[model samples]
Target: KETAAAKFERQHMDSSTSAASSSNYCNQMMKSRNLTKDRCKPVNTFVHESLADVQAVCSQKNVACKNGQTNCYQSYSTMSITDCRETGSSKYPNCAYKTTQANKHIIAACEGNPYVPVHFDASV
Candidate 1:
């Protein structure tokens, strides 16, 4: 079974692509990353940084998660990332996405002894 930390890596980590590419970035990534498997993920962000940098976010100032959880932390530095949003006409099995790139601080929820990121809360 996949742990929350591992699932976070699968859904958000994408260090290979330093910056956003062609318009097909989301279309290609969303599929390649298996986010379109069961159903289209409404929205997701891919961070273009080393795993260590992202993991370090868990040690930053504590903050409230979107759902009011207090286990979230905001990154101290802005990072290159791409946001994948499901298009209005998108349908399962043919999941479509729009890619928007930006450099911003990320917020992630973390847990467990190692205290790794378990969920992407938001980007500021």
Candidate 2:
């Protein structure tokens, strides 16, 4: 029973290190953080920005979510991030990922008390 806040923390937040230096960041994170549990998430982004900066985005511009929900917001600053893309041959129980580093503004769905990020919408 994972809460949305908990899930976001597990999948996206990495405040301690801003290192987009490791190409293995996604590979290691995806599995160690339990994103590889049921099946590999096709694609995911992890922001290197502080949790506070990410949370503040909730008060920023409103955008449309893929699910047609307009609860998404975009971060003002371009953030250091790691994108985990499942390899073409990625198989269950052993997900393989292509780790990439990019500087981009992030979009996320915000919700609940304090209005923190609950789901990763996209990055641009």
Candidate 3:
């Protein structure tokens, strides 16, 4: 079974990919990662860092999550990442996206005994 930690990695981690991508990056990646099912994910982010580095965020300074949860933590260092947003003209089965590359500090929600990242909160 897929755990939240596993799901987070599947949805956000792109460690092996370049900091930037071609125009079709999101279109291809979103589908390939099974995010285009039923309904397209409205927005998502890909972090170009190792799983260990991302998981380490759980040990950094804590902050409030969007829902005001206290389990969120922000990375101490900036990281390369890409933001993918669904286009207004996009629809189901043919989802399209706009990709933007950036370098920023990430915030993620952590849980479980191992305290791995389970949810992406935001970036700064």
Candidate 4:
């Protein structure tokens, strides 16, 4: 018997081919695909610290949280507090503590699109 992971893999792999079709065609294909029962990973929902909370934390630490320099860590899975930080390249020396603090314990997959949760198991 195929496990949920196997079913998810099969369905996901098949759906990739549907991308070639036009919008209308893709919609139809998706409907058909949906009809075929297939198990998939559950979507994870999470909440990050609010702007106020971030500000409070930054203030206590004496870190300069500039506008556009600081952002909330959004993701579909529960993440550790360590993973929020300033965004930019690490090549140039600016602030290591800020960079490290900003990027620790972050859910790697969910960083890009917070709404659409990423699905991957041991095999992946």
The TM-score of predicted model 3 comes to: 0.96
Residue pairs clashing in model 2 are none
Q: Is candidate 1 or candidate 4 better by lDDT?
A: 1
Candidate 3 structure quality by residue, lDDT tens digits, 2-72: 99989999999999986866878888888888899999999999999998999999999899999999999
Which parts of model 3 are misplaced by more than 4 Å? none
- In the range 1-124, model 4's lDDT, one tens digit per residue, is 8654343333333322312323233223323444212422122111133323222321221211223322222233222232112234312233111211121222211112222212221110
Point out the higher-scoring one by TM-score: 2 or 4: 2
Q: List TM-score per model, in order.
A: 0.97, 0.91, 0.96, 0.23
Best-performing candidate as measured by TM-score: 1
Residue-pair clashes per prediction, in order, are 0, 0, 0, 2
Top candidate by lDDT: 1
Q: What count of clashes does model 3 give?
A: 0
Q: Candidate 2: where are CA atoms >4 Å away?
A: none
Ten contiguous residues with the weakest lDDT in model 3: 17-26
- Give all candidates' CA lDDT scores: 0.94, 0.87, 0.93, 0.25
Q: Quickly count the clashes in candidate 4.
A: 2
> Candidate 1: minimum summed lDDT over ten consecutive residues — where?
15-24
Q: In model 4, which residue pairs have backbone atoms overlapping below 3 Å? A: 84-102, 85-102
Report the Cα lDDT for candidate 2: 0.87
